[PDB]
Amino acid sequence: WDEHDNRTRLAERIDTVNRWKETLDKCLTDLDAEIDSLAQAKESAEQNLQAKNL
Amino acid sequence: RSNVELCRDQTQYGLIDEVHQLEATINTMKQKLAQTQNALDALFKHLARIQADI
Amino acid sequence: GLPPAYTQHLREMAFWDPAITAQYLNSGPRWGCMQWRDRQIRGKEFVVTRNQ
Amino acid sequence: CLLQEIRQQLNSDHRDKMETLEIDRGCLSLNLTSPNISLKVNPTRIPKDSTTL
Amino acid sequence: RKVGERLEDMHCWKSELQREIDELSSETDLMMAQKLRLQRALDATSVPYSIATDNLQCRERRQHPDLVRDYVEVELLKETELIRNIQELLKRTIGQAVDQIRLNREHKESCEMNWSDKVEVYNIDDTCSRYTNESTQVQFYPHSSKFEE
Amino acid sequence: LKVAQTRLDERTRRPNVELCRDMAQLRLVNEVYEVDETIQTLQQRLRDS
Amino acid sequence: WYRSNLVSFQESNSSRHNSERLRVDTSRLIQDKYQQIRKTQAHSTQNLG
């Protein structure tokens, strides 16, 4: 019986770490999306400045 | 397990308790062996006695 | 229709990782540890990919 | 710049937890009648970082 | 007398095995730590690459009657090439490091196994040796070749 | 792997400005590395056999 | 003698079970790798076209 209860403990531990894993993954995906968009806005503003001498 | 992920969990305590309980059980079983051997020796004694009497 | 990880690279401003691809698609590689070899013995099972 | 550093730190943490998952599922996979099961000096020890829950 | 001699001779090897296993584990610790240091350094490397790219981009941005080229562009290109070579060499080094970790752990496991074996055998003979003629644990068990193997 | 490398090779001959770091190059290098790890795993299975 | 016999037969059974469970997942890995390679190849040719 002691063996069995230890097995159940490890089961719950692994389940919790799994769900934390998936949340972290989705956050990283959003990270990439926002980084790309920020880049785009930066270049656009840059040429907007570039035209400002004519 | 690397760096900060090394954690003190209920699993650790459960395993340690298993180990200690296990040593106790080990000792008690050996004691039972001792008493049973004593009984066997005594019975052989009386067997020899009886055969001589016969 | 493509992952933003590759969209980020196919550009001009240097921002991509000092690596090959994104990781969240991948698995145990990129500097993993505990590769498990099952020593062969006459007497006990031969569990392989004990990863179940 | 700041978001760059955030990206790298999060990636590091992710790979660490993946390591932990690999190890403990391997442990659970291990069971009775195993090939490498042995006895080791003082398993009752505590490691040398000792982080609480 | 003979059996006691054997016991002491075992105890020797047991001691040295324990000690050497301990140094092995310490070495594993040190190498793991240095590997992590390398990893974070590789993390640190990336920023100046972006800085240099922005530098060259902004310098390109310029008005018609001024567009020139010297060390500045040449040296910046040298920076970029240097950076790239640095990354590739870092990756190869970390690969070799992790393979070394693998080999170390494998040998650790093997020696640990054999030490376990010696411990059980030594304890068995210790439990054996306290026998005496008058005492218990005294039986008729028949001869057989398994005893003589 | 043979054919994938082959297709990768030549495109660095292209003249000055039309040479690009195309998503073709991206996906090609991804395929190269990925099939490398695939090969390693299969050889390990072989040893097991 | 009785113990020797039992040992022999149980050992045989252990070996056989090992081999079977190896067969299953090896077979699995074969086709999954094949299909993913096909998918990547098609992706590449599409882009360059």
From Swiss-Prot, chain C:
Transmembrane segments: none
Cellular location(s): Cytoplasm, Cytoskeleton, Cilium axoneme; Cytoplasm, Cytoskeleton, Flagellum axoneme
Role: Microtubule inner protein (MIP) part of the dynein-decorated doublet microtubules (DMTs) in cilia axoneme, which is required for motile cilia beating. Located at the center of the tektin bundle where may function to recruit tektins or stabilize the bundle.
Subunit (UniProt): Microtubule inner protein component of sperm flagellar doublet microtubules.
Name of this chain's protein: Tektin bundle-interacting protein 1
Record lineage: Eukaryota, Metazoa, Chordata, Craniata, Vertebrata
Shown segment, full-protein numbering: 104 to 155 of 206
Curated annotation (Swiss-Prot), chain D:
Compartment list: Cytoplasm, Cytoskeleton, Cilium axoneme; Cytoplasm, Cytoskeleton, Flagellum axoneme; Cytoplasm, Cytoskeleton, Microtubule organizing center
Post-translational modification: Ubiquitinated, leading to its degradation. Deubiquitinated by USP16, promoting its stability. Tyrosine phosphorylated.
Expression (tissue specificity): Expressed in the testes (at protein level).
Assembly, per entry: Microtubule inner protein component of sperm flagellar doublet microtubules. May interact with CCDC172.
Function noted in UniProt: Microtubule inner protein (MIP) part of the dynein-decorated doublet microtubules (DMTs) in cilia and flagellar axoneme. Plays a key role in the assembly or attachment of the inner dynein arm to microtubules in sperm flagella and tracheal cilia. Forms filamentous polymers in the walls of ciliary and flagellar microtubules.
Protein family membership: Belongs to the tektin family.
Name of the protein described by the UniProt record: Tektin-2
Segment of the intact protein contained: 163 to 215 of 430
UniProtKB/Swiss-Prot annotation, chain E:
Post-translational modification: Ubiquitinated, leading to its degradation. Deubiquitinated by USP16, promoting its stability.
Gene disruption: observed consequences: In a 129S5/SvEvBrd genetic background, males show progressive reduction in fertility with almost complete loss of fertility after 5 months of breeding. Testis weight and histology appear normal. Spermatozoa have significantly reduced forward motility. The sperm flagellum shows defective bending in the midpiece region which impairs waveform propagation and forward propulsion. Sperm ATP levels deplete significantly over time, probably as a result of excess energy consumption from inefficient flagellar beating.
Tissue spec: Detected in testis, where it is weakly expressed in round spermatids, and strongly expressed in the flagellum of step 16 elongated spermatids (at protein level). Expressed in spermatozoa. In the sperm flagellum, localizes to the principal piece and midpiece (at protein level). Specifically expressed in testis; not detected in other tissues tested.
Superkingdom of origin organism: Eukaryota
Subcellular location: Cytoplasm, Cytoskeleton, Cilium axoneme; Cytoplasm, Cytoskeleton, Flagellum axoneme
Similarity comment: Belongs to the tektin family.
Subunit (UniProt): Microtubule inner protein component of sperm flagellar doublet microtubules.
Protein name, UniProt field: Tektin-4
GN (gene name): Tekt4
Shown stretch of the complete protein: 101 to 249 of 447
Curated annotation (Swiss-Prot), chain F:
Intracellular or extracellular location(s): Cytoplasm, Cytoskeleton, Cilium axoneme; Cytoplasm, Cytoskeleton, Flagellum axoneme; Cytoplasmic vesicle, Secretory vesicle, Acrosome outer membrane
Protein's recorded name: Tektin-3
Post-translational modification summary for this protein: N- and O-glycosylated.
Covered range of the whole protein: 393 to 441 of 490
Phenotype of gene-disrupted mutants: Sperm with reduced motility (47%) and forward progression and increased flagellar structural bending defects. However, normal fertility is maintained.
Expressing tissues: Expressed preferentially in testis. Expressed predominantly in late pachytene spermatocytes and early round spermatids. Expressed in spermatozoa.
Subunit structure: Microtubule inner protein component of sperm flagellar doublet microtubules. Interacts with TEKT1, TEKT2, TEKT4 and TEKT5. Interacts with CCDC38.
Similarity section: Belongs to the tektin family.
Protein function: Microtubule inner protein (MIP) part of the dynein-decorated doublet microtubules (DMTs) in cilia and flagellar axoneme. Forms filamentous polymers in the walls of ciliary and flagellar microtubules. Required for normal sperm mobility.
